[PDB]
């Protein structure tokens, strides 16, 4: 294992950087039973710090103590991970050979924090710096003139081949379009308000659905296979005028017939048929109402597999009203967060190098989505330049990891941290459990089991103050412990 080599930049903690020929790396530590491991970030510098301490038969005292209910389950997890925009893609490839390796096995090899899944743009987004469709050939309804463009064949694929071939979790692929082809949207405009042409059913609707089809062949031809589709990335923002990028714009009711009458039986009447259906792919404030829409026609539920929620500018909002009543009606389609980025104020600066606020925001919104019944979690772009491009429309946000091309590094954010503590130790299959608090406290916490029956709890502390605790599994015993203020932690243990 090699340490962080830490840098400030002036904001409250370091990046880690990375270079040709170094970069700071680990696979989780069970030791032996009766024994717990502990992994430790700080706004002070430390970074998934491995210590270990006893599990004690017995425990006294008045201080918070947390109790794991391993008889209460709840969700699957599905996992995590982040998306292989253009942008993304442009960044890793500035970067020299060795360089770009140990930015990929940082994200995908248990050297590093093991994501096992990659979001993919079908085509263009606002984080591309071409705008086009895989279906650009005016009023080809046959779709005879589809093709992946070189930002698929020479960017995204290979990349995507590389960053399976660094993992052994197997990786999961969820695709999501921005845009149609112009010639089948109301406004002839890649931006802007604009929807599909005519009504689900029709031939706009049908030629869309293959569209669908029609990119799962192609990467398909590459060795790629997709784990699901979303239905349209972020479907509410191309009904608002003046939308500034891609986009396809559709109601719930919109969307509930396309998924029943289009999208639904072309999918299940292809090669592609094992392809899960995420809906929604939008931000929280729509929920409950468009799963209400969509999961009630019978024949549009019976292809949803599960509902993709984003998080943008409410990292730190409360869940029960959207995620928990959305769960409680429907608990039978997943939730999954396909989408999470921080945003800056339209005046400021997109990248923060080093803001541990920036870290805590992503592990306590995944703290709260698996909270809420949430089985993953996918970050945003996975590479950024300092400005936070590039981006066709200087939409610029921030990114776990940035790329200094004019000095082969990359720097490693507190959210890639945040996010590691989460990715590295829950592997898919892990099911969330009970954990019980003795007294009101700050913290945030989570507690899971592995598939194999292990332990494992995230504790994050967004205080400044230290709050010593207890952490107690009624089958070994009592972990003793601190979280220090501006921390955060994940502890291990075997329970057999
Ligand atoms: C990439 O990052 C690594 C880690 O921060 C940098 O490693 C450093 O590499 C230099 C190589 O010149 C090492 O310097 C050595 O200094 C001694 C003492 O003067 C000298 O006798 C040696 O010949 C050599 O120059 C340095 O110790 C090493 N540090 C670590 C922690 O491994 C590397 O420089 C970075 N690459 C670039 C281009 O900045
Ligand atoms: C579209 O595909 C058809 C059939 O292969 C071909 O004849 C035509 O040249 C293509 N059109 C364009 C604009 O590439
Ligand atoms: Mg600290
Ligand atoms: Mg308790
Ligand atoms: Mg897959
Ligand atoms: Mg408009
Ligand atoms: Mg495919
Ligand atoms: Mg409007
Ligand atoms: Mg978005
Ligand atoms: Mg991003």
């Known amino acids: 294992a090699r340490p962080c080599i830490p840098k400030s930049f002036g904001y409250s903690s370091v990046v880690c950087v990375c270079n040709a020929t170094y970069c700071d790396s680990f696979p989780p530590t069970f030791p032996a039973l009766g024994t717990f491991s502990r992994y430790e970030s700080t706004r002070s510098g430390r970074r998934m710090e491995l210590s270990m301490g006893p599990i004690q ?42 360089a770009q390796n140990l ?95 005519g009504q689900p059913g029709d031939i706009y609707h049908q030629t869309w659905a293959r569209y669908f089809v029609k990119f799962l062949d192609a990467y398909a031809e590459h060795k790629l296979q997709f784990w699901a589709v979303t239905a349209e990335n972020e479907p509410s923002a191309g009904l608002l005028s003046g939308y500034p990028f891609q986009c396809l714009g559709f109601t719930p009711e919109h969307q509930r017939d396309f998924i029943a009458r289009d999208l639904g039986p072309t999918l299940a009447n292809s090669t592609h048929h094992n392809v899960r259906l995420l809906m929604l792919d939008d931000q929280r404030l729509l929920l409950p109402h468009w799963a209400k829409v969509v999961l009630t026609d019978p024949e549009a539920a019976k292809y949803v ?50 803001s541990w606020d920036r870290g805590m925001q992503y592990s306590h919104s995944i703290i ?78 989570v507690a899971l089991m592995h598939p194999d029956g292990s332990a494992v709890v995230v504790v994050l502390n967004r205080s400044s103050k230290d709050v010593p605790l207890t952490i107690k599994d009624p089958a070994v015993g009592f972990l003793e412990t601190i979280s220090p203020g501006y921390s955060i932690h994940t502890y291990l243990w075997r329970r057999q």
């Open 57 to 98: 038969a017995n425990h006294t005292g008045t201080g918070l103590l947390l109790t794991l209910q391993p008889e209460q389950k709840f969700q699957k997890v599905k996992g995590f991970g982040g998306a292989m925009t253009d942008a993304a893609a442009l960044n890793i490839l500035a970067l020299s050979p060795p």
């Open 103 to 197: 930015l990929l096995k940082s994200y995908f090899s248990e050297e590093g924090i093991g994501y096992n899944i990659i979001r993919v743009p079908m085509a263009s987004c606002d984080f591309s710096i071409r705008t086009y469709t895989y279906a650009d050939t005016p009023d080809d309804f046959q779709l005879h003139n589809f093709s992946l463009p070189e930002e698929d064949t020479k960017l995204k694929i290979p990349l995507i081949h590389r960053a399976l071939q660094l993992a052994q979790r197997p990786v999961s692929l969820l695709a999501s379009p921005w845009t149609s082809p112009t010639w089948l949207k109301t406004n002839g405009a890649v931006n802007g308000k604009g929807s599909l042409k």
């Open 305 to 354: 597999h599960g509902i993709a929620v984003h998080w943008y500018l409410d990292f730190l909002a409360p869940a029960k009203a959207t995620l928990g009543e959305t769960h409680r009606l429907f608990p039978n389609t997943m939730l999954f967060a396909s989408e999470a980025c921080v945003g800056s104020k339209f005046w400021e600066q997109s990248v923060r190098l080093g």
């Open 368 to 445: 709260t989505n698996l909270l809420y019944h949430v089985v993953g979690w996918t970050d945003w772009n996975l590479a950024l330049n300092p400005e936070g491009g590039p981006n066709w429309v200087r939409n610029f946000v921030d990114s776990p990891i940035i790329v200094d091309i004019t000095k082969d590094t990359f720097y490693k954010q507190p959210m890639f941290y945040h996010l590691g503590h989460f990715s590295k130790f829950i592997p898919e299959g892990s099911q969330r459990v009970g954990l019980v608090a003795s007294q009101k406290n700050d913290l945030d916490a």
